[PDB]
Amino acid sequence: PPEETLSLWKGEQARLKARVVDRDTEAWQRDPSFSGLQKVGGVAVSFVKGDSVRACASLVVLSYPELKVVYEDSRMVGLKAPYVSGFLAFREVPFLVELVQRLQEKEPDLMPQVVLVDGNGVLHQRGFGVACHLGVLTELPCIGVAKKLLQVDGLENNALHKEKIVLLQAGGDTFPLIGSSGTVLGMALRSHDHSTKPLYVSVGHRISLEVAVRLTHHCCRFRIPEPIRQADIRSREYI
């Protein structure tokens, strides 16, 4: 009953968006060296077309500060119709929740304290990206780490944007992503000395933007934050 389904999802999008928290809720987040942080998660998803859409997803957990994989669960499943633009997350995210639930059941001591999501946070067409959606359904702190600048609220990959990227001279350097509204939606981060291409970081849930950006940088042994890099490898394996 697709009209019923999409209508339900539209209501849920509004309700879930209102649940997004953009401040820190954990003691470890307020410590300058993130004292108390031991486990960082990574999530990545790739889709495949077919009679049914398939999703290849990976949840990994890494030790922190060491960034070594301590848990992994990577899967390919079919997702159920209806497939509606702007609402694929309403099939995708419950599958990701299932991964988290399986971790809680099978290895509860390895539950991540924060999840780095390969995808968008509040820097999103409707201010409710996959990282927000996963966060509110699990109550886990989540960060949206995007590889491209999302064109919302007047953000443009224009000449000035490109100039600001050049002026990111070293790993850790940032510049704010500020909408036409004047709202700070996220930060561009040069994640590593080796790469000149920035990551675009925004809050998913239960973390502040400053903390999200600093933690993201600290997870970058290479350009892509290690939990995402590891999840990416495993969700391309299934592709």
Residue numbers in the entry: 9 to 247
The authors write:
Removal of inosines from genomic DNA is dealt with by the base excision repair pathway as well as endonuclease V (EndoV), which is considered the major player. The mouse genome encodes a single EndoV homolog, mEndoV. Our data show that mEndoV shares substrate preferences with hEndoV by catalyzing cleavage at inosines in RNA and being inert towards inosines in DNA. The structure determination of mEndoV revealed a protein fold which is to a large extent similar to human and prokaryotic EndoVs.
The first 9 residues on the N-terminal end are disordered with no specific conformation. The region around residues 167–174 contains a mammalian specific α-helix similar to that of hEndoV. The structure of mouse EndoV reveals a new conformation of the highly conserved strand-separating wedge motif. The invariant Tyr residue, normally pointing into the DNA/RNA binding groove and stacking with the DNA/RNA substrate during catalysis, is facing away from the groove. For this reason, the DNA/RNA binding groove in the crystal structure of mouse EndoV in the unbound state is wide and shallow. In contrast to all other reported EndoV structures, the invariant Tyr91 in mEndoV is interacting with the backbone of the protein through hydrogen bonds to Ser60, Val61 and Leu87. In order to stack with nucleotides in the active site pocket, the mEndoV Tyr91 must undergo a transition to the trans side chain conformation for χ1. The MD simulation suggests that the wedge motif has some flexibility and that the invariant Tyr might flip between two conformations, of which a probably unbound or unproductive state is shown in the structure of mEndoV. The corresponding region in mEndoV is 225-HHCC-228, and our structure of mEndoV reveals that the first two Cys residues in hEndoV are replaced by histidines with no change in the local geometry. The latter two Cys residues are conserved between mouse and human EndoV, and with similar conformations and local environment in the two structures.
